[PDB]
């Protein structure tokens, strides 16, 4: 079946927009969340297509302030709000007659995997959750937290006087990287090298909100919702050690797949059929289909 | 001088309302945050009068969704947002021409002490911070989180359908206390007994937000802002041990004042003059007045 443009409303009044990949008959479903500061457009659509071809209806949408979705400022990341919006997505999805409401899973890549795990921590309507190379910590060096926090205070006060929101680049003109931005600055050239457009700016408030967000503090609440982590062995962008630390904080039932020999992104050039068959088997075993 | 009605706009578009207790000349200032789900009207006004009489201009306002301030749902507690609103309160104090911009301190009681420590962790424009009997953790029995999280999920879906927000009582009809409501159910009869009006309802969304809020994530960032914790020795509502554990997570410069033989709130019948004198001495030493 062809993909559809869809939109749905959040509790806080925003329209989020995305793509629906309907399966050929009523059955399981999957809500897919993209990487850090990225729209739905890159990488995930072909994965959605693969799941759709295996009977899973997929929802792929632009988070708040990204891509085609409402939200101001743009490129202003809020994990707590984004997890909340996944609850609103589940609410929306349940009304689709192709969707068995006991077979709604969440799937997330990179920052989307952080938000996916957090949403699974809170929403027992979710039948299963998969996190692929999740971004666990944005703190960076906490002794360069001070400049960005000062910028965040200046940004508030300036916007209160009608100024535009302040943004940080992934890479300063002097070649520097702002404190919590090395993953972004590392991924951007590889993505753009492959023709994937990248918004190379992020609101300074993004760093403020992440200091109060610690996924390690809520992942113990996912259980008994089955959860799978998919961790590249050689992830230097989202440190493999961080991802395994998160897995260690989770309770059973939880399942781990290590992508042997792969980094944060280059697994897309490996045996992706076998990667997705493994995740499909996880979903089949736990959502029963 | 007489107290004035004041109001100020937050970055996210709300009008918060409060009282101003102006000192007789330009000098230090103090932003005062009340306890859990409580308006500005209780206990704090007389403390503000005392600070005003010692030369400190006080702002005492209703948090979002409380009392005279904007916010929907009502009685929906969001520590992250309330700390953000403390940043906008600092901006309002700085931008108005009554106080010395380098002598703006934060003061908070109970849950207000939590938000005060959080705000001081992020905002280096603050000259000093005082937390009195800060509420550190509202998780309650984590094995009891499920009925509330389910109600939170249901509230979201219902409100999207046009329905009114769902609230919980401090005391259920069978005499039971909802999971994170033991402090509130304990303090309510005592305040009402003294004629202090108590809103005995809390949004089900309050527990949802609080699980992603852990003040111990950020209090190590307060330093170098001088911070003072005032802890009742026999606090059974916010366990003294939680408070001291928070204090040990903080760095220097910090100062601790144990209120010997006092509970969460009954220190208000003791030697408050000497209690406040130790806080005034703390402020004088760090704000040079
Ligand atoms: Na964080
Ligand atoms: Na593997
Ligand atoms: Na509906
Ligand atoms: Na909490």
Tab-separated table of C-alpha atoms in Angstrom, chain B residues 24-272:
chain	number	residue	atom	x	y	z
B	24	UNK	CA	12.207	51.679	52.034
B	25	UNK	CA	15.214	52.065	49.681
B	26	UNK	CA	16.960	50.298	46.795
B	27	UNK	CA	18.615	47.198	48.136
B	28	UNK	CA	18.519	43.421	48.198
B	29	UNK	CA	15.578	41.448	46.897
B	30	UNK	CA	14.049	38.053	47.610
B	31	UNK	CA	11.763	35.875	45.461
B	32	UNK	CA	9.692	33.598	47.681
B	33	UNK	CA	8.196	30.289	46.554
B	34	UNK	CA	5.457	28.585	48.591
B	35	UNK	CA	4.960	24.951	49.483
B	36	UNK	CA	3.364	22.052	47.643
B	37	UNK	CA	0.175	23.030	45.792
B	38	UNK	CA	-0.166	26.101	48.047
B	39	UNK	CA	-0.939	29.736	47.183
B	40	UNK	CA	1.221	32.654	48.281
B	41	UNK	CA	-1.320	33.643	50.969
B	42	UNK	CA	-0.218	31.195	53.700
B	43	UNK	CA	2.668	31.791	56.156
B	44	UNK	CA	4.978	33.411	53.597
B	45	UNK	CA	3.363	36.909	53.733
B	46	UNK	CA	4.406	37.497	57.346
B	47	UNK	CA	7.885	36.171	56.596
B	48	UNK	CA	8.040	38.607	53.681
B	49	UNK	CA	6.957	41.422	56.028
B	50	UNK	CA	9.845	40.507	58.340
B	51	UNK	CA	12.400	40.556	55.504
B	52	UNK	CA	10.895	43.842	54.247
B	53	UNK	CA	11.350	45.335	57.722
B	54	UNK	CA	15.017	44.277	57.509
B	55	UNK	CA	15.543	46.090	54.208
B	56	UNK	CA	14.822	43.327	51.653
B	57	UNK	CA	12.211	43.820	48.947
B	58	UNK	CA	10.194	40.596	48.573
B	59	UNK	CA	8.230	39.189	45.650
B	60	UNK	CA	5.684	36.566	46.676
B	61	UNK	CA	3.653	35.140	43.820
B	62	UNK	CA	1.298	32.304	43.033
B	63	UNK	CA	2.953	29.595	40.896
B	64	UNK	CA	1.406	28.523	37.616
B	65	UNK	CA	-2.082	27.105	38.025
B	66	UNK	CA	-2.372	28.280	41.646
B	67	UNK	CA	-4.361	31.017	43.329
B	68	UNK	CA	-4.519	34.219	41.312
B	69	UNK	CA	-2.039	33.180	38.565
B	70	UNK	CA	-2.833	31.900	35.093
B	71	UNK	CA	-2.446	28.245	34.205
B	72	UNK	CA	-4.539	25.315	33.029
B	73	UNK	CA	-5.082	22.728	34.339
B	74	UNK	CA	-5.232	24.281	37.810
B	75	UNK	CA	-3.205	22.679	40.600
B	76	UNK	CA	-0.962	20.951	38.053
B	77	UNK	CA	2.550	21.037	39.480
B	78	UNK	CA	5.545	21.145	37.120
B	79	UNK	CA	8.843	21.732	38.930
B	80	UNK	CA	10.820	22.261	35.706
B	81	UNK	CA	8.407	24.946	34.542
B	82	UNK	CA	8.199	26.594	37.958
B	83	UNK	CA	11.996	26.862	38.037
B	84	UNK	CA	11.817	28.397	34.558
B	85	UNK	CA	9.265	30.893	35.861
B	86	UNK	CA	11.722	31.772	38.640
B	87	UNK	CA	14.121	32.782	35.854
B	88	UNK	CA	11.444	35.078	34.438
B	89	UNK	CA	10.817	36.405	37.962
B	90	UNK	CA	14.509	37.278	38.287
B	91	UNK	CA	14.257	39.063	34.937
B	92	UNK	CA	11.221	41.058	36.132
B	93	UNK	CA	13.071	42.088	39.303
B	94	UNK	CA	16.173	43.039	37.328
B	95	UNK	CA	14.201	44.964	34.704
B	96	UNK	CA	12.143	46.924	37.107
B	97	UNK	CA	13.934	49.899	38.737
B	98	UNK	CA	13.385	49.124	42.450
B	99	UNK	CA	16.043	46.599	43.546
B	100	UNK	CA	19.812	46.139	43.243
B	101	UNK	CA	20.204	43.696	40.326
B	102	UNK	CA	23.250	42.048	41.970
B	103	UNK	CA	21.388	41.256	45.220
B	104	UNK	CA	18.485	39.092	44.005
B	105	UNK	CA	18.142	35.995	46.212
B	106	UNK	CA	15.726	33.052	46.046
B	107	UNK	CA	13.773	31.675	49.006
B	108	UNK	CA	11.534	28.640	49.046
B	109	UNK	CA	9.533	26.505	51.450
B	110	UNK	CA	8.745	22.795	50.998
B	111	UNK	CA	8.177	22.164	47.256
B	112	UNK	CA	9.155	25.802	46.763
B	113	UNK	CA	12.547	24.917	48.223
B	114	UNK	CA	12.933	22.229	45.577
B	115	UNK	CA	12.180	24.674	42.771
B	116	UNK	CA	14.434	27.265	44.423
B	117	UNK	CA	17.424	24.902	44.455
B	118	UNK	CA	16.712	23.934	40.836
B	119	UNK	CA	16.476	27.559	39.731
B	120	UNK	CA	19.711	28.397	41.547
B	121	UNK	CA	21.347	25.469	39.715
B	122	UNK	CA	20.666	27.070	36.322
B	123	UNK	CA	20.580	30.876	36.848
B	124	UNK	CA	23.862	32.537	37.873
B	125	UNK	CA	22.132	35.939	38.030
B	126	UNK	CA	20.838	34.753	41.434
B	127	UNK	CA	23.021	36.049	44.260
B	128	UNK	CA	21.959	33.511	46.921
B	129	UNK	CA	19.407	30.799	47.595
B	130	UNK	CA	17.648	29.564	50.737
B	131	UNK	CA	15.665	26.314	50.846
B	132	UNK	CA	13.519	25.729	53.942
B	133	UNK	CA	12.452	22.102	54.510
B	134	UNK	CA	12.745	21.333	50.770
B	135	UNK	CA	10.607	18.531	49.375
B	136	UNK	CA	13.143	16.234	47.750
B	137	UNK	CA	11.190	13.241	46.406
B	138	UNK	CA	7.477	12.667	45.694
B	139	UNK	CA	7.771	9.168	44.208
B	140	UNK	CA	6.154	7.495	47.204
B	141	UNK	CA	5.909	3.753	46.764
B	142	UNK	CA	7.180	3.207	43.190
B	143	UNK	CA	5.182	-0.048	43.106
B	144	UNK	CA	2.068	2.155	43.427
B	145	UNK	CA	2.899	4.322	40.388
B	146	UNK	CA	0.826	2.169	37.998
B	147	UNK	CA	-2.746	3.291	38.878
B	148	UNK	CA	-1.676	6.937	38.718
B	149	UNK	CA	0.253	6.629	35.446
B	150	UNK	CA	-2.768	4.883	33.936
B	151	UNK	CA	-4.997	7.750	35.071
B	152	UNK	CA	-2.478	10.186	33.600
B	153	UNK	CA	-2.662	8.382	30.257
B	154	UNK	CA	-6.446	8.442	30.477
B	155	UNK	CA	-6.568	12.139	31.407
B	156	UNK	CA	-4.548	12.961	28.270
B	157	UNK	CA	-6.925	11.080	25.981
B	158	UNK	CA	-10.017	12.517	27.706
B	159	UNK	CA	-8.790	16.116	27.563
B	160	UNK	CA	-8.077	15.690	23.858
B	161	UNK	CA	-11.753	14.673	23.529
B	162	UNK	CA	-12.871	17.978	25.067
B	163	UNK	CA	-13.231	16.639	28.596
B	164	UNK	CA	-12.179	18.505	31.733
B	165	UNK	CA	-8.831	17.695	33.399
B	166	UNK	CA	-8.880	14.887	35.933
B	167	UNK	CA	-7.949	15.652	39.541
B	168	UNK	CA	-7.140	13.451	42.536
B	169	UNK	CA	-8.073	14.120	46.169
B	170	UNK	CA	-5.589	14.292	48.989
B	171	UNK	CA	-7.754	11.654	50.714
B	172	UNK	CA	-9.827	9.103	48.812
B	173	UNK	CA	-13.334	8.306	50.012
B	174	UNK	CA	-12.211	5.089	51.714
B	175	UNK	CA	-9.661	7.122	53.709
B	176	UNK	CA	-6.738	6.051	51.526
B	177	UNK	CA	-4.017	8.436	50.339
B	178	UNK	CA	-2.948	8.441	46.643
B	179	UNK	CA	0.669	7.479	46.068
B	180	UNK	CA	2.569	10.747	46.128
B	181	UNK	CA	0.101	12.595	48.361
B	182	UNK	CA	1.184	11.754	51.915
B	183	UNK	CA	2.767	15.136	52.708
B	184	UNK	CA	-0.256	16.938	51.263
B	185	UNK	CA	-2.854	14.827	53.069
B	186	UNK	CA	-0.906	15.336	56.308
B	187	UNK	CA	-0.455	19.111	55.988
B	188	UNK	CA	-3.985	19.915	54.757
B	189	UNK	CA	-5.967	19.311	58.005
B	190	UNK	CA	-3.371	21.281	59.958
B	191	UNK	CA	-3.540	24.331	57.692
B	192	UNK	CA	-7.351	24.227	57.425
B	193	UNK	CA	-7.556	23.910	61.224
B	194	UNK	CA	-5.795	27.289	61.387
B	195	UNK	CA	-8.153	28.783	58.805
B	196	UNK	CA	-5.653	28.623	55.922
B	197	UNK	CA	-7.595	27.641	52.759
B	198	UNK	CA	-6.323	24.392	51.238
B	199	UNK	CA	-6.976	23.240	47.673
B	200	UNK	CA	-7.457	19.529	48.355
B	201	UNK	CA	-7.096	18.504	44.685
B	202	UNK	CA	-4.082	17.879	42.472
B	203	UNK	CA	-3.963	17.171	38.745
B	204	UNK	CA	-3.213	13.549	37.915
B	205	UNK	CA	-0.536	14.996	35.608
B	206	UNK	CA	1.444	16.219	38.649
B	207	UNK	CA	2.708	12.696	39.398
B	208	UNK	CA	3.600	12.102	35.728
B	209	UNK	CA	5.858	15.167	35.497
B	210	UNK	CA	7.497	14.510	38.851
B	211	UNK	CA	8.906	11.117	37.851
B	212	UNK	CA	11.115	12.846	35.279
B	213	UNK	CA	12.142	15.437	37.933
B	214	UNK	CA	14.966	14.555	40.330
B	215	UNK	CA	16.462	17.590	42.071
B	216	UNK	CA	19.583	15.558	42.906
B	217	UNK	CA	20.380	15.601	39.161
B	218	UNK	CA	21.272	19.300	39.305
B	219	UNK	CA	21.956	20.575	42.834
B	220	UNK	CA	25.678	19.917	42.327
B	221	UNK	CA	25.468	22.722	39.731
B	222	UNK	CA	24.358	25.355	42.263
B	223	UNK	CA	27.891	26.265	43.370
B	224	UNK	CA	29.364	28.999	43.300
B	225	UNK	CA	25.978	30.510	44.112
B	226	UNK	CA	25.869	30.526	47.944
B	227	UNK	CA	23.111	28.204	49.109
B	228	UNK	CA	21.541	27.644	52.524
B	229	UNK	CA	19.416	24.644	53.481
B	230	UNK	CA	17.197	24.963	56.570
B	231	UNK	CA	16.120	21.467	57.656
B	232	UNK	CA	13.765	20.542	60.534
B	233	UNK	CA	15.427	17.774	62.533
B	234	UNK	CA	12.226	15.722	62.889
B	235	UNK	CA	10.718	16.228	59.440
B	236	UNK	CA	8.517	13.231	58.657
B	237	UNK	CA	6.702	14.850	55.705
B	238	UNK	CA	9.858	15.539	53.669
B	239	UNK	CA	12.191	13.108	55.450
B	240	UNK	CA	15.084	14.899	57.137
B	241	UNK	CA	17.302	12.199	55.623
B	242	UNK	CA	16.260	13.088	52.066
B	243	UNK	CA	17.035	16.734	52.824
B	244	UNK	CA	20.468	15.997	54.292
B	245	UNK	CA	21.245	13.660	51.401
B	246	UNK	CA	20.398	16.520	49.047
B	247	UNK	CA	22.638	18.864	51.047
B	248	UNK	CA	25.556	16.437	50.754
B	249	UNK	CA	25.065	16.353	46.983
B	250	UNK	CA	25.619	20.137	46.944
B	251	UNK	CA	29.055	21.774	46.725
B	252	UNK	CA	30.517	24.753	48.589
B	253	UNK	CA	29.700	27.485	49.356
B	254	UNK	CA	26.806	25.951	51.260
B	255	UNK	CA	25.458	26.270	54.781
B	256	UNK	CA	23.096	24.030	56.751
B	257	UNK	CA	20.731	25.019	59.567
B	258	UNK	CA	19.054	22.194	61.501
B	259	UNK	CA	15.881	23.249	63.330
B	260	UNK	CA	16.318	21.046	66.402
B	261	UNK	CA	13.209	19.245	67.609
B	262	UNK	CA	10.936	20.645	64.886
B	263	UNK	CA	8.814	19.003	62.205
B	264	UNK	CA	8.014	19.996	58.634
B	265	UNK	CA	5.939	23.042	59.532
B	266	UNK	CA	5.591	23.248	63.305
B	267	UNK	CA	8.768	25.327	63.534
B	268	UNK	CA	6.407	28.252	62.791
B	269	UNK	CA	5.409	28.145	66.474
B	270	UNK	CA	9.016	28.274	67.677
B	271	UNK	CA	11.684	30.976	67.706
B	272	UNK	CA	11.150	32.150	64.127
